Design a protein around this ligand. Structure first.
Ligand SMILES: O=C(O)c1cc2cc3ccc4oc(C(=O)O)cc4c3cc2o1
Lengths: 7, 267
């Protein structure tokens, strides 16, 4: 559920 | 002149490094010219990536921004030599591993992020990608450092119509209309970040939630803190607080110093 989000 | 260690970090390339001249810990960041969209010229007028332009503008004096120690141009890339604290963990890994932060800890962190963004603004730099992943924690000194100005711009007072930062931290005016002003967009992103800290994850993932203007608290959060978050996440830009208003907010009072934060929460 929690994740990184790229630019 | 530098001894190159192993990757630290996706699609980016930052290596551990030690300056031979004095064994200073450095981070060595490589950027491909093929992938640089924004270019600028230095105080002396050599054509460099904007990231370098902005790092130079923020990198003099002491601050809560990772400092650019030097840089070199290569045939297909630029290399950037940056500060490297030790021991360190980024704020995203830290929230993943420890979960929702205690308010005292969130307050110290957030305050320091405010001082660091104020410092950028004062130097003419808009970061445009404030998020837990772009914040390093020096676990001994209890100091936060902002990183990655690769999506940034020179601060201006007119409208921006381009944006290459993180979408889930971008404001509703960008989502809905493809336009924003710098500071007010920065404040929105800081409200996402604050929620992220006190709830253990960001509040919105989908466009409709971003533009929706509804903030649900999944954790117990004090009501002065809920009010600051909701203020920062006002749908209408002009209703968001200024930086001074954020720092004068009652939730922000009696902030711990960095050492105190390290001693109480990090050691
Ligand atoms: O132990 C670690 O994981 C660790 C230590 C560490 C120091 C860094 C110092 C400057 C930086 O700038 C960027 C950037 O992308 O601009 C990334 C980093 C960076 C990533 C790092 O990861």
């Amino acid at each position: 559920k929690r994740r990184r989000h790229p630019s | 002149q530098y001894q190159v260690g192993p990757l630290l970090g996706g699609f980016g390339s930052v290596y551990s490094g030690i300056r031979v001249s004095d064994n200073l810990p450095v981070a060595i960041k490589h950027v491909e010219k093929d992938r640089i969209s924004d270019w600028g010229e230095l105080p002396n007028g050599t054509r460099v990536p904007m990231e370098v332009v902005l790092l130079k503008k923020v990198s003099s004096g002491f601050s809560g921004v990772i400092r650019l120690l030097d840089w070199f141009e290569r045939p297909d890339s630029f290399v950037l030599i940056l500060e490297r604290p030790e021991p360190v963990q980024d704020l995203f890994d830290f929230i993943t591993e420890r979960g929702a932060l205690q308010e005292e800890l969130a307050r110290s962190f957030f305050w320091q992020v405010l001082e660091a963004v104020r410092h950028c603004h004062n130097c003419g730099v808009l970061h445009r990608d404030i998020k837990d992943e772009n914040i390093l924690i020096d676990l001994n000194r209890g100091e936060l450092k902002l990183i990655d100005f690769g999506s940034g711009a020179l601060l201006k007072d007119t409208v921006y119509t381009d944006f290459d930062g993180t979408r889930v931290y971008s404001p509703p005016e960008w989502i809905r209309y493809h336009r924003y002003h710098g500071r007010s967009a920065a404040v929105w992103s800081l409200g996402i970040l604050l929620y992220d800290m006190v709830c253990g994850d960001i509040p919105f993932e989908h466009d409709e939630e971003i533009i929706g203007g509804q903030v649900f608290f999944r954790q117990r959060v004090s009501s002065e803190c809920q009010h600051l978050i909701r203020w920062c996440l006002a749908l209408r830009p002009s209703d968001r607080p200024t930086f001074e208003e954020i720092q004068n907010h009652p939730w922000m009072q009696d902030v711990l110093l960095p050492q105190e934060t390290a001693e109480i929460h990090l050691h």
